[PDB]
Amino acid sequence: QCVNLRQLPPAYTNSFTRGVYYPDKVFRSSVLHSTQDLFLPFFSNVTWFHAIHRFDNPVLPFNDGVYFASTEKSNIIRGWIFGTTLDSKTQSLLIVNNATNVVIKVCEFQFCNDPFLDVYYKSWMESGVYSSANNCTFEYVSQPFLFKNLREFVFKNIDGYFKIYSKHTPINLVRDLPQGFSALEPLVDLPIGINITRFQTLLALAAYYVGYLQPRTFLLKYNENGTITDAVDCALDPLSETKCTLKSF
Amino acid sequence: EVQLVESGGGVVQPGGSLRLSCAASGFTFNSYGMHWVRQAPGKGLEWVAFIRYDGGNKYYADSVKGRFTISRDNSKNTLYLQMKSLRAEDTAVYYCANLKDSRYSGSYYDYWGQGTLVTVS
Amino acid sequence: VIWMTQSPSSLSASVGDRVTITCQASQDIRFYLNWYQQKPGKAPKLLISDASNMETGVPSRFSGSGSGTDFTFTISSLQPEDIATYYCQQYDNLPFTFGPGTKVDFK
Ligand SMILES: *[C@@H]1O[C@H](CO)[C@@H](O[C@@H]2O[C@H](CO)[C@@H](O)[C@H](O)[C@H]2NC(C)=O)[C@H](O)[C@H]1NC(C)=O
Ligand SMILES: *[C@@H]1O[C@H](CO)[C@@H](O)[C@H](O)[C@H]1NC(C)=O
Ligand SMILES: *[C@@H]1O[C@H](CO)[C@@H](O)[C@H](O)[C@H]1NC(C)=O
Ligand SMILES: *[C@@H]1O[C@H](CO)[C@@H](O)[C@H](O)[C@H]1NC(C)=O
Ligand SMILES: *[C@@H]1O[C@H](CO)[C@@H](O)[C@H](O)[C@H]1NC(C)=O
């Protein structure tokens, strides 16, 4: 059933060159391509949350898209909720992973005050996430979405489509994000057609990075295999502006 | 933990101008949009202006539209309101706030400042 | 612009009495109405959002409901600490607007 789990101040880290994804499905190679899209700004302040420290796992704004990343070994983070009022009055998007699969549903979910998944539990998705749900319009099932392992996701909501990008890499850091460039790949395009203004992270009963996308111009460097190996944020500094103008890293 | 503090209030003559600011702390200011609300003595609440988290889109009440400008600086966590061509009718206590909003700004928590008095005479 | 009104503009009630406040919109705003409570010298506090959703920390004696143009705010049993001015506010569209405000006096 629904139970109460619960406010602490935010910490901040730096997304040095993280949050870049392939802007489209067009193959390019051995070329510097200039594109305009919603990307995480370079060297920005990313909010670092500790959901378990006292439980504090707040609802955050979606804005124009969300940059989400986390590092762990136990796989405590299970999924996300995206919607508006996040109750039975509106359609909401529930994305939750388990050991063998991922289930994505859009329904009029009446979510719990402090929603979570139960390791030892109705159904697996219904344990502590919501009390009821009806009028389902979308259902999708596929393969799981989720030293230490760093998992990076970008969530966009454009013209009714909820677009998810992701990357999975090894990490050997404790306090902050890694340096270097790595682009996120398209994961799934979901033809849902709902309003998303806010979101929340679902845990199994924990820390994560949250940033936001901006209308930014980037110069992307594609190697001989069509992989992006670098990028320039054309609105970061005079040096980057010069590099973008001259099309040269 | 969360606070909003207004400053820059004072007394000006009609036709003059006054600039307000609000210092935000205890929360991720740069992820939320912000509102200005004013309340005259003996009167109810009146909404003034809204700015989105990225400092882009700006909205104003018709009663102040064309005279007031809303802006912000996310590197200093400070919200600003620039008041030009002030009238006697603009006398009010001005507040900065993060109003709970499930449609536009995506604000889950409702925050208010202390209020600063702006007098035009 | 959506115009808002409230009735009565003022009411008197004693402790234990049930207090109801009516907020009406000139336009249909579905379920996007906020209710605030203000005492002299302080900024307004949010009690109810989304027409009927209670905020964290708000006493169970407070409630409300409604949809479209006609909404009601209710205090099931007035306490001595509930003497305040209540406001309704719509956030269905921009600009945001507040109603006149209903003052609750102690009888
Ligand atoms: C992960 O989630 C999937 C989908 O909910 C689970 O598969 C279902 O399992 C139930 C039995 O509990 C069956 O009745 C359903 O027909 C299955 N659905 C599908 C699409 O296969 C899966 O068992 C879950 N994995 C774990 C480890 O719990
Ligand atoms: C990030 O926050 C620090 C303060 O801790 C500030 O000095 C810096 O300029 C901010 N950078 C950005 C991009 O906001
Ligand atoms: C189900 O949701 C849709 C919106 O996607 C709405 O139009 C429809 O009326 C809802 N059905 C019921 C029975 O409420
Ligand atoms: C989004 O909200 C608007 C206004 O309430 C509504 O008309 C529309 O149906 C919603 N979109 C969805 C959930 O498809
Ligand atoms: C491109 O792929 C080849 C393998 O076919 C590999 O040897 C080469 O190092 C790759 N180039 C880059 C820049 O990764």
Residue numbers in the entry:
A (entry chain A): 14 to 19, 23 to 69, 78 to 145, 150 to 174, 184 to 242, 261 to 304
B (entry chain H): 1 to 121
C (entry chain L): 1 to 107
Sentences from the paper on this structure:
The SARS-CoV-2 spike (S) glycoprotein is exposed at the surface of the virus and mediates entry into host cells. The S1 subunit contains the receptor-binding domain (RBD), which engages the receptor ACE2 (5, 7, 9, 10), and the N-terminal domain (NTD) that recognizes attachment factors. The S2 subunit contains the fusion machinery and undergoes large-scale conformational changes to drive fusion of the virus and host membranes, enabling genome delivery and initiation of infection.
Although multiple antigenic sites are present at the surface of the NTD, a single supersite of vulnerability is targeted by neutralizing Abs elicited upon infection and vaccination. To improve the cryoEM map resolution of the B.1.617.1 and B.1.617.2 NTDs bound by S2L20 and visualize the structural changes associated with their respective constellation of mutations, we used focused 3D classification and local refinement. All of the B.1.617.2 mutations are found within the antigenic supersite: T19R, G142D, E156G, and 157–158del. The T19R substitution abrogates the glycosylation sequon at position N17, as supported by the lack of a resolved glycan at this position in the cryoEM map. We previously showed that T19A, which also removes the N17 glycosylation sequon, decreased binding to 4 out 5 NTD neutralizing mAbs tested. Residues 156–158 participate in the supersite β-hairpin and their mutation/deletion in the B.1.617.2 NTD lead to striking structural remodeling: residues 151–159 adopt an alpha-helical conformation whereas this segment is mostly β-stranded in the absence of this mutation/deletion. Out of 11 neutralizing mAbs tested, we observed a 10-fold or greater reduction in binding for 8, 10, 10, 10, 3, and 11 mAbs to B.1.617.1, B.1.617.2, B.1.1.7, B.1.351, P.1, and B.1.427/B.1.429 S as a result of the introduced mutations and deletions whereas the non-neutralizing S2L20 mAb efficiently recognized all S trimers through binding to antigenic site iv, confirming proper folding.
